[PDB]
Design a protein around this ligand. Structure first.
Ligand SMILES: Nc1ncnc2c1ncn2[C@@H]1O[C@H](COP(=O)(O)OP(=O)(O)OP(=O)(O)O)[C@@H](O)[C@H]1O
Ligand SMILES: Nc1ncnc2c1ncn2[C@@H]1O[C@H](COP(=O)(O)OP(=O)(O)OP(=O)(O)O)[C@@H](O)[C@H]1O
Ligand SMILES: Nc1ncnc2c1ncn2[C@@H]1O[C@H](COP(=O)(O)OP(=O)(O)OP(=O)(O)O)[C@@H](O)[C@H]1O
Ligand SMILES: CC(=O)N[C@H]1[C@@H](OP(=O)(O)O)O[C@H](CO)[C@@H](O)[C@@H]1O
Ligand SMILES: CC(=O)N[C@H]1[C@@H](OP(=O)(O)O)O[C@H](CO)[C@@H](O)[C@@H]1O
Ligand SMILES: CC(=O)N[C@H]1[C@@H](OP(=O)(O)O)O[C@H](CO)[C@@H](O)[C@@H]1O
Ligand SMILES: CC(=O)N[C@H]1[C@@H](OP(=O)(O)O)O[C@H](CO)[C@@H](O)[C@@H]1O
Ligand SMILES: CC(=O)N[C@H]1[C@@H](OP(=O)(O)O)O[C@H](CO)[C@@H](O)[C@@H]1O
Ligand SMILES: CC(=O)N[C@H]1[C@@H](OP(=O)(O)O)O[C@H](CO)[C@@H](O)[C@@H]1O
Ligand SMILES: [Co+2]
Ligand SMILES: [Mg+2]
Ligand SMILES: [Mg+2]
Ligand SMILES: [Mg+2]
Ligand SMILES: [Mg+2]
Ligand SMILES: [Mg+2]
Ligand SMILES: [Mg+2]
Ligand SMILES: [Mg+2]
Ligand SMILES: [Mg+2]
Ligand SMILES: [Mg+2]
Ligand SMILES: [Mg+2]
Lengths: 469, 469, 469
């Protein structure tokens, strides 16, 4: 029986942001969302989020996650800038006064923390019958972390905060994770005893370690060797460094599952993205949101896809796209812009300097060059000529165009919506299509060529003129 | 006198791929190709590749490399999943029974191994009169390597494999390279004595160390301090990390030779690429295949070139190109797509949102904006207007267009192949060119402008209407 | 009272470049410019630059910086390849013979050196009454640095250069910064006593340490823990590594000030760039020269801006631009090329495959697709149709076009400069505009559509023909 408290009440002033700190994102989720996903997997009996600074902007998102995760998540409000020890006191208020389960506490800015680490914490805590178990780790740069203070017999005595540590204490590289399990009675007693004699004048939760030690209570540290799992974020530098570590691990899981990632350092992959076996991802690529890539694809370089579905054997190169689907064996790129609602069929092709928006494009159809396709349905095995525009917009309103199958439209055709081009139709180079075109018809509008001989000697005497001569 | 065996018979299941593991590439060559290039430089008397899993897909490529490298390379087949010790037994079958040279063994998944390291191994082995010399190194992360076991007098006694090592043995950071030299008689004797009592139930080649030691034979380790040279690849994570290390060294050799690489971490250069002095390469760039860049060029950012030749003093910026040539002093980019068969002359320019395919473009000629050039020959000092298309394709078949020198073609011209435009000709804005245009002629086809006054008050009463008013 | 000497007389042959070494750049400034900016902040009484190899190409830039920094900077010439000790002798010639201030010496290839480090050096030197104070640091890779030699009592005795060090001395990781403060009398005496018995046959300045020690003079080392601040550059590998370290620190200062940088490793920011709070910069981005970005912007990915001003709340995505301004709330990208003289108003939009050059574009105006805008002024709340060209160039000369407010121009319009389009005007799809268009007029020129029925059965019997049928 366990209640988990997430301390998320701090203003995060060190972030220098108007967006609440625990709402900043890495790998496609907020820090608070990462932490709550980890805890929901653990499935504790109670789950309490302590909010404070900006709680009105954050509490609605907690409600949304609770629904997403199918569990209730209680919010307790902290109403004074009085420290993490006070944040826990506020969290305990959302429990019955006679609650008797363990109390696990973690901060909302420890975004890599995982269900396995929390399960091991609770198991260790129960096993040693501790009044408090604290997670620690050891770091090359421990700046801003509480330092773990140990006796000669290597027994934990205290945690001293960065701003309160002597210069020698600062050299201590073993740090507090700020993740703990508590016997609830011992915890309640130690919190009433905290005072604020420290550089912040706050009630530090970390002081409960020395308080419990002094009461002859069992105090256990558990060393997490994989430091990233308990690393915190107090500023944008730390955020980007954990985002990078998280990203290296996401990429590694895909590489172990059969995805060639040429350059993990420049390949950003959000946590929900799936990628099929033998896909190759080239450098400078970000796969974001709920993107799904099939097997044997080629993606990148310099591609960004957000919520894009790509089938098997497709290539998607130097492409910026969102909310779109690319069928099996399709070729997209290089230099292609996909806007929401784009659906390209299997074996289709969207080539260089092409943009598509809210259009359906059939099996085997190709739009290879310098073209805008907006609000259009195109059939199968058609070919749209270079430098064409689906003119959806008449200055005030937008309309659909329908192009059939096996069509071959000429370069520099304008399709002035609404118009329909029937199956197997053609248009000439340079055509402005304003009326329906029957199946098997050729539609044209360009006037005839006239050559004006010796124009250049007459109007440009000197340069093309010489050489004409 | 030396025979070299390359063990390449493993399935590489940890790669999770349908492409045979030793065929995966880094810096433009397969792992197997890297290893064989290194060994061919050494020029041993015999060169034997042991294949096994997927040998039918791999053996043809060995034959091709043998021709490329101008030497014969024998293939021996391993027909049971029975371990590296069995792989060597299979390799020895391709030698005469009375062969008396040294036997050098390396694995096909040690892709940075180099001729110098192998020459030093053989020289050390001869110098100490060893029955076996093994290369070792020391690593921060030795996961999956055999650990080197030494006596108190620092004498090598055994190699223990990752899956067979005690927890304390696993902490050993000195690892087996899997690169060895052998006295052939001692090797044959130790291989007949191997048994398979280990976590894989295989005949481990690494057991020959302890077997030879126990026979009172001289067993020498040689420590290679530069670990990357003997690092192995068993999965895609390791592959990308060695590809990155190899790439850092290729870039460093160019930087030492006089190439400014702004950001080596995002500049990927294949092993055969050459680059001239005082070229500057900007971030996000990959130079691949047999690309050659002259001196005093500017390349990047975000450029990918595969088998592209670029002369001196050229700039090639935000360009995706292959199988093409760019003359001296030419400007390509930003946002330019070069397809095979593109040849741009000296001082030529291919600008933004331009794609060229299978076309020759003369000295000093410029195609600066929003244009597709396909199957065309253009002369010198010509200027192709913005938003033009060389219409090579009539719906079924493709044709050539010829444009001469000192031509000035108008924006929005379509060149409907086959057509010829003579020297110093012009075309008007908006022309569809379907017939030959004489030298010094102006070709036109756009109809005259008509202004329909007060159209907007009549047809859009409200917005542009207000403001017209 | 202090005179600072900057030794910048070496040829930098290890750079392999025709551009003088101290003129190579990082973060938007030459190494020599970084060093002189640092020293000017310190504001010493005298500032002497010793030049030598290529002094005629470098001295003018020293003069320019002197003006920029508002102080006089003397240049002394070194006329023999005779070593850093000789370089200091040459520098001293620019001082009066009875000068009695401290002499600080640093090299022109220590580009991260900062005013604080130099102030601390001078303060330490005065405090210990040293004849010489030398800055040292300790490095993982000390290759090519002088090694610091210390007695058992940890007293500095000598500096030994890389090319002169025994193998054991080479293992020394404590290195010479080549930054010193001197008592002038002691310095003059030690320099006259140098000889050239070393691997370069030069007068090494570093020998003055042992000379002063042997005279019973006070010799102080001051250890700079932050090594990058005193790291040198002798080749392109070192240059790129310090450029990367400098870049990590510039990015970190923006992150601490409130800028989200998703990926500091692929985000390059020059030293003078300013960025507003809550801007997010996506990967693959370089901000260069005097770029200024407002707050709450989105920049990147794959964006390069040089001297571009961007207002608040703007987005600038996959954009290559220079010498341009982007107003508040404007949207630029993806795939957009801005050339000098581009000014986009607030809430304006330049979309995919758009290039603008020397044009002013009013509040709320949009050029969203496949368009070139050159030498044009466009008013407010106008909409330029897809695939249009502002034809500025008639084959010989360039002209301006003026488009008013609330205009709606049709796709595939050519604007043949000089032309004016009045407020609230329209043009039709496919129009070639050669004459002025009154306010509220519709200008057109495309001929009428004709459908040629059954063309395809007749001219392509087979494929679109079948399916027409
Ligand atoms: N405005 C506040 N409202 C509610 N609780 C607060 C507030 N300020 C501080 N606290 C409590 O005190 C603890 C420490 O506060 P502090 O101001 O150091 O927050 P931080 O977010 O950790 O750091 P900073 O804001 O300095 O970057 C917070 O975690 C929170 O529990
Ligand atoms: N299917 C096989 N055919 C031929 N030889 C094999 C086969 N399987 C294994 N072997 C031999 O046994 C050795 C060890 O085999 P193992 O299956 O561990 O191969 P691996 O490629 O090293 O690893 P994995 O396939 O587990 O990633 C291989 O190097 C090879 O010599
Ligand atoms: N051609 C020269 N002109 C003037 N002074 C020189 C010249 N060559 C060397 N010196 C002096 O001798 C010192 C050492 O010279 P060296 O040739 O090692 O220069 P470097 O730039 O440090 O190295 P390298 O050129 O070997 O990369 C230089 O710093 C300079 O003071
Ligand atoms: C008083 C207190 O709770 N301090 C904790 C807490 O610090 P913050 O300054 O609140 O971020 O979280 C750190 C872990 O992220 C931990 O090391 C430290 O001990
Ligand atoms: C070819 C075309 O006319 N596209 C129009 C049209 O683009 P969309 O792709 O629907 O966003 O609507 C825009 C206004 O919503 C206008 O800016 C643009 O010119
Ligand atoms: C039994 C055997 O040969 N094991 C070798 C061999 O391991 P693999 O598991 O086969 O990749 O290659 C490693 C070097 O890449 C070496 O460390 C190890 O000892
Ligand atoms: C300007 C033009 O008409 N280009 C044609 C033409 O492009 P290529 O550059 O030759 O691949 O052939 C294609 C079919 O092979 C067709 O998809 C396209 O529309
Ligand atoms: C004789 C001399 O002055 N050597 C100095 C000097 O070396 P160079 O080889 O001149 O770059 O600068 C180094 C610091 O960048 C310093 O470590 C070394 O001691
Ligand atoms: C639309 C147009 O005609 N642009 C012309 C025009 O481009 P600029 O953007 O001014 O550089 O001048 C160029 C010669 O200076 C010529 O190459 C090009 O074709
Ligand atoms: Co047209
Ligand atoms: Mg505070
Ligand atoms: Mg605080
Ligand atoms: Mg914190
Ligand atoms: Mg196996
Ligand atoms: Mg195995
Ligand atoms: Mg292996
Ligand atoms: Mg020299
Ligand atoms: Mg030298
Ligand atoms: Mg130097
Ligand atoms: Mg057009």
């Amino acid at each position: 029986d366990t209640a988990v408290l997430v301390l998320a009440a701090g203003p995060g002033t060190r972030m220098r942001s108007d967006t609440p700190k625990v709402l900043h994102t890495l790998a496609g989720r907020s820090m608070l969302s990462h932490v709550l996903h980890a805890i929901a997997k653990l499935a504790p009996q109670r789950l309490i989020v302590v909010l404070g600074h900006d709680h009105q902007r954050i509490a609605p998102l907690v409600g949304e996650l609770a629904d997403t995760l199918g569990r209730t998540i209680d919010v307790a409000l902290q109403d004074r800038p009085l420290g993490t020890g006070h944040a826990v006191l506020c969290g305990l208020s959302a429990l019955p006064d006679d609650y008797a389960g363990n109390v696990v506490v973690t901060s909302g800015d420890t975004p890599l923390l995982d269900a396995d680490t929390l399960a091991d914490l609770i198991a260790t805590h129960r096993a040693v019958s501790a009044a408090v178990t604290v997670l620690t780790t050891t770091l090359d740069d421990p700046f801003g972390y509480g330092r773990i203070l140990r006796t000669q017999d290597h027994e934990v005595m205290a945690i001293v905060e960065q701003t309160d540590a002597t210069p020698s204490q600062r050299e201590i590289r073993e740090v507090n994770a700020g993740v703990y399990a508590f016997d609830i009675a011992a915890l309640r007693s130690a919190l009433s005893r905290l005072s604020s004699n420290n550089a912040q004048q706050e009630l530090y939760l970390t002081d409960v370690i020395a308080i419990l030690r002094s009461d002859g209570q069992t105090v256990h540290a558990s060393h997490v060797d994989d430091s990233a799992l308990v690393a915190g974020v107090n500023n944008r530098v730390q955020l980007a460094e954990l985002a990078s570590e998280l990203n290296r691990r996401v990429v590694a899981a895909h590489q172990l599952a059969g995805v060639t990632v040429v350059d993990p350092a420049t390949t950003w992959i959000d946590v929900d993205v799936t990628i099929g076996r033998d896909t190759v991802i080239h450098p400078g690529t970000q796969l974001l949101g709920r993107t799904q890539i099939g097997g044997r694809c080629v993606v990148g370089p310099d591609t960004t896809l957000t919520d894009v579905a790509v089938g098997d054997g497709a290539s998607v190169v130097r492409t910026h796209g969102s909310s779109s689907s690319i069928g099996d064996g399709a070729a997209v790129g290089p230099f292609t812009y996909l806007r929401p609602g784009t659906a390209l069929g299997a074996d289709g092709k969207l080539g260089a300097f092409v943009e598509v928006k809210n259009s359906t494009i059939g099996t085997g159809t190709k739009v290879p060059h310098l073209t805008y396709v907006g609000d259009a349905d195109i059939g199968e095995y058609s070919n749209i000529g270079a430098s064409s525009v689906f003119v959806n917009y008449d200055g005030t309103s937008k309309r659909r165009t329908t192009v059939g199958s096996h069509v071959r439209t000429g370069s520099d055709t304008m399709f002035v919506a609404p118009v329909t081009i029937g199956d197997g139709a053609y248009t000439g180079a340079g055509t402005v299509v304003r009326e329906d075109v029957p199946p098997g018809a050729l539609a044209v509008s360009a006037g005839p060529q006239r050559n004006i001989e010796n124009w250049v000697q007459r109007k440009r005497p000197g340069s093309p003129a010489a050489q004409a001569s």
